[PDB]
Enzyme design. Structure first.
Site, PDB file in Angstrom:
ATOM      1  CG  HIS A   1      42.646  33.773  38.777  1.00 50.07           C
ATOM      2  ND1 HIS A   1      41.836  34.472  39.650  1.00 50.07           N
ATOM      3  CD2 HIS A   1      43.257  34.707  38.011  1.00 50.07           C
ATOM      4  CE1 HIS A   1      41.956  35.765  39.421  1.00 50.07           C
ATOM      5  NE2 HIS A   1      42.815  35.935  38.429  1.00 50.07           N
TER       6      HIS A   1
ATOM      7  CB  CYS B   1      43.305  38.883  40.492  1.00 54.46           C
ATOM      8  SG  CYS B   1      41.527  38.934  40.284  1.00 54.46           S
TER       9      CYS B   1
ATOM     10  CD  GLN C   1      41.105  39.195  30.179  1.00 53.46           C
ATOM     11  OE1 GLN C   1      41.909  39.448  29.283  1.00 53.46           O
ATOM     12  NE2 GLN C   1      41.356  39.454  31.457  1.00 53.46           N
TER      13      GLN C   1
ATOM     14  CB  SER D   1      44.483  40.138  33.394  1.00 52.74           C
ATOM     15  OG  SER D   1      43.160  40.547  33.108  1.00 52.74           O
TER      16      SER D   1
ATOM     17  CG  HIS E   1      45.408  34.354  34.632  1.00 57.03           C
ATOM     18  ND1 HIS E   1      45.679  34.745  33.347  1.00 57.03           N
ATOM     19  CD2 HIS E   1      44.637  35.323  35.179  1.00 57.03           C
ATOM     20  CE1 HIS E   1      45.092  35.911  33.115  1.00 57.03           C
ATOM     21  NE2 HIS E   1      44.455  36.278  34.207  1.00 57.03           N
TER      22      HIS E   1
END
Length: 153
Positions: free
Chosen positions: A49, A103, A121, A144, A147
């Site tokens: 990701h 990330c 998540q 976060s 993505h």
């Protein structure tokens, strides 16, 4: 017909017919299938990701910058850009993930290893299992940030 989450759609104020997945938010001009039944979903999957954080992530910080200041809007803008660039064949997921993912998984070209449901998540998880091996998601939002998910296994 059409795998889980897919539906033929059309652009507003336009006539382009495309297929959209409500679970992965992915778009494509090609029909998602051409029979298999009761197949279900994978018990476990492997994904990579690219995360783009905005000033509203649960942690507005990453190895790229101590303080993320961009907005969600700007983050979504960056996301669509990467997807478009990936789809055009001008850049590959791995290289963009290594360069611009907020990330720490960027060091591994965005690779997160394998996981099952209840590990990631919820929104991220849902997209991951709605993807077939080799498919990339569309903009996916979590705490976060936003993505782009690529299922590799």
């Amino acid at each position: 017909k059409l795998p889980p989450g897919w539906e033929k759609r059309m652009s507003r104020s336009s006539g382009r017919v495309y297929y959209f997945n409500h679970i992965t938010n992915a778009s494509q001009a090609e029909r998602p299938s051409g029979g298999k039944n009761g197949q279900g979903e994978p018990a476990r999957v492997r994904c990579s990701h690219l995360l783009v954080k905005h000033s509203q992530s649960r942690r507005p910080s990453s190895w790229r910058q101590e303080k993320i200041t961009r907005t969600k809007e700007e983050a979504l803008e960056l996301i669509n850009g990467y997807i478009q660039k990936i789809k055009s064949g001008e850049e590959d997921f791995e290289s963009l993930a290594s360069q611009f993912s907020d990330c720490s998984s960027a060091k591994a070209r965005g690779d997160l290893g394998a996981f099952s449901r209840g590990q990631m998540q919820k929104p991220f998880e849902d997209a991951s299992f709605a993807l077939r091996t080799g498919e990339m998601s569309g903009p996916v939002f979590t705490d976060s940030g936003i993505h782009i998910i690529l299922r590799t296994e």
